[model samples]
Target: LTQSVLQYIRDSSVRDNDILRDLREETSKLPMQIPPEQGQLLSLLVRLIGARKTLEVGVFTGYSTLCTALALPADGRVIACDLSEEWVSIARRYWQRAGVADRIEVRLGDAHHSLEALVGSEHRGTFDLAFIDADKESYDFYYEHALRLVRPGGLIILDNTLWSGKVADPSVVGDPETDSLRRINAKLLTDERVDLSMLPIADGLTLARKRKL
Candidate 1:
């Protein structure tokens, strides 16, 4: 997006509290957090769905976690998964500061295993929304599990589908990350069970609304 257009979007919709802003700044060294626009969109999606139970597959400093938690009601919960306790520790502080720590639970380890456990347990078809932003190669795995865990008519969101435009470039073929994204993007395009939309914002965000059977 052009600077002017981007500025308009950012200025009009992005709202950040001190804790979130501070977390963003402090995590700048890693710089893997979602853009503010994407975070706002996530919050909007959560509110739109009146989402109470969310499954987040990546928790890099928990920016999106905070956004989703903030949008949820008091008893709402976000099951956040990540591999980095150090970074998630930072996230925990912010979640506490934001007064949403109780609404979020962190699971550290392989997200695939965590998701599987949820599928095997009480989370099946109970989650209102799922966001996948972890390992690209495991995205397909995550999406499949998320599909099962999220109730019919719920939503599953995947990040970095475009892979910084690499998925669309023939010359960029064969890179594992790009290939994995391309595979999932193609699958989602033809998947009959979900209504899909790929928004070209912040890498790429794909939303899949699970079809009620």
Candidate 2:
């Protein structure tokens, strides 16, 4: 998408308040937080399903986490997993400022461990939705865990799948990040358990809905 077109897309639908705006300002330094429009779509999706329980595989200053939290009903909860206590602390501050601190539970340490723990516990097939935005190399691991954790008809949202448009380019090669994305993008097309759609948002966003068992 062209810059102006992307700007127009965001201007049309993105809804941000002071808390989110300030959070975005602080997070701009590190820059993993999804674009405003992307986060807006996330909020919309959460509401679309009337999701009560959600999960986040990576919490980058909790931007997307806050978006999800705000969209949920008062009783809804989101379990956020990430390795950096520092970044999560930044996330927590904004979550608190947004008054959604109580709605979120941050799990520190490796996301892989966190996902494994959830898979082993009673959480299997319990989540209504999951947003994955973490280390690209281990996306498959998280995807499998997310598949098991989200109930049938639940959504698994994967970010950065477009890898900055590199997946479609024949000239790019050997980069682990792009390779990882390519594999997953290709795999989802034939994956029988889910209905998939790869959207052309910032970077690339994929929505894989788990079908009935």
Candidate 3:
């Protein structure tokens, strides 16, 4: 870590994930965390929406959890749903250290079922934000769950919707991930429930606003 050498290192590391220096330090060792570029954008969406109650369909190592948590108020909260008990345990450690553990609740199990249970117990129009970044094949189901949970004018963010630019290419149709995304995209376009915008950030980020009724 010499002067010129340190300067080069600092410059190279000054990316979006760099903002959460402590959080990233822990995430660096994790096997899977969404890339910093997209995670940062997720945080930005929270800030833009002034999100207080959010839900994340995937909690892989909590990289996105930490990013979203950072944008929240001390009283703000997120319900992170994932099937991996072990991975979420790792995320919980860093979240505890980040002092966001209290704000984020990690639930281990099928996310869709969890949503069904919660929606049954909790009232509708309770969530401020929803992020679907879990199994690609279940994206459309997640979108439906998100629509039910989020309030009017709330935000629903679907990650990896483009599947690395494969949706437009016919050759990739057989690929399960790409095909699932294509189906989800098609459904979202005609759903009439929300106004949508697809962004090129990362693989592809689909931001849809729940229209006021």
Q: Residue 158 in model 2: shift from native, Å?
A: 0.5
What value of lDDT does candidate 1 attain over all alpha carbons? 0.90
Which model, 1 or 3, shows the larger lDDT?
1
Candidates' C-alpha lDDT: 0.90, 0.89, 0.81
Worst 10 residues of 2 by lDDT: 25-34
List model 2 lDDT by residue over 6-72, tens digit each.
Answer: 7887788787788888888888877354588888899999999999999998786888899999999
Candidate with more favorable, higher TM-score: 2 or 3: 2
TM-score of each: 0.95, 0.96, 0.85
The TM-score measured for candidate 2 stands at 0.96
Q: Can you write out model 3's per-residue Cα lDDT over 29-115, one digit (the tens) per residue?
A: 655334566776787889988999998888877878888898999999998897677677678877887788899987789887888
Q: Rank the candidates by lDDT, best first.
A: 1, 2, 3
* Least accurate 10 contiguous residues by lDDT in model 3: 10-19
Which residue pairs show backbone clashes in model 2?
none
